[PDB]
Amino acid sequence: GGALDLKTQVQTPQGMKEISNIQVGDLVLSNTGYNEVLNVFPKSKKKSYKITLEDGKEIICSEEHLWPTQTGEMNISGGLKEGMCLYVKEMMLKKILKIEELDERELICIEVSGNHLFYANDILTHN
């Protein structure tokens, strides 16, 4: 799937954890409850972007990383823009204020079960 900055926080039953410390078999919170981490991939340096929401939430992801919106999943390469809304916990729409290009950063991909979604920095994201 996509890739997210190493320090991105995901919600486990035992508390928030940085995604670089997530292991296969961990549980991560989604909009439906907890999905299981089915796989992790090696971190790698990738061109990255920062999405900043109107409520101050920020997430750093790859250009093709998919984000649920009210009109369907979208990524930055496929035309996710400032002025559109993402879902924050719990399923509250929040406007994207800025999308900025952040140069090369270490990003990491995890894959989860179920609806393949999980909250990342409290923003609902796709695998």
Residue numbers in the entry: -1 to 125
Q: Can I see the authors' text?
A:
Protein splicing is catalyzed by intervening protein sequences termed inteins. The protein-splicing reaction involves the self-removal of the intein and concomitant joining of the two flanking sequences (exteins). All splicing domains found among inteins have the same structural architecture named HINT (Hedgehog/INTein) which relates to the C-terminal domain of the Hedgehog protein (Hh–C or hog domain). Instead of the N-terminal serine or cysteine missing among class 3 inteins, class 3 inteins contain an additional nucleophilic cysteine residue in block F.
We assumed that introducing the unique WCT motif found in class 3 inteins into a class 1 intein together with the first Cys/Ser to Ala mutation could possibly result in a functional cis-splicing intein if they were closely related by a divergently evolved lineage, similar to class 2 and BIL domains. We introduced the WCT motif on the gp41-1 intein based on the amino-acid sequence alignment. However, the engineered class 3 gp41-1 intein (gp41-1_WCT) produced dominantly the C-cleaved product and only a minute amount of the possible splicing product. To better understand the structural basis for non-productive splicing of the engineered class 3 intein, we solved the crystal structure of gp41-1_WCT at 1.85 Å resolution. Unlike in the crystal structures of MchDnaB1_HAA and MchDnaB1_HN, we observed electron density for the N-terminal extein, confirming that gp41-1_WCT is inactive in proteolytic cleavage at the N-terminal junction (N-cleavage). The catalytic triad of Cys124-His65-Thr143 and Trp67 from the WCT motif in the MchDnaB1 intein can be precisely superimposed with the engineered triad of Cys107-His63-Thr123 and Trp65 (0.39 Å for the r.m.s.d. was obtained for the 35 heavy atoms of these four residues excluding Sγ of Cys124), except for the χ1 angle of the nucleophilic Cys107. The presence of the N-extein (see below) likely induced the trans conformation of Cys107 in gp41-1_WCT. Among the three inteins used in the MD simulations, gp41-1_WCT with the N-extein showed the most abundant population for gauche- and the χ1 angle of the introduced Cys107 was much closer to the ideal 180°-trans conformation than to ~200–210° observed in the other simulations for the two MchDnaB1 inteins. The WCT motif engineering on a class 1 intein did not lead to similar rotational dynamics of the active site residues, indicating that additional compensatory mutations are necessary for splicing-active class 3 inteins. A comparison between the splicing active MchDnaB1 intein and the WCT motif-engineered non-splicing gp41-1 intein derived from a class 1 intein implies that accumulation of random mutations in a class 1 intein would not directly lead to a class 3 intein.
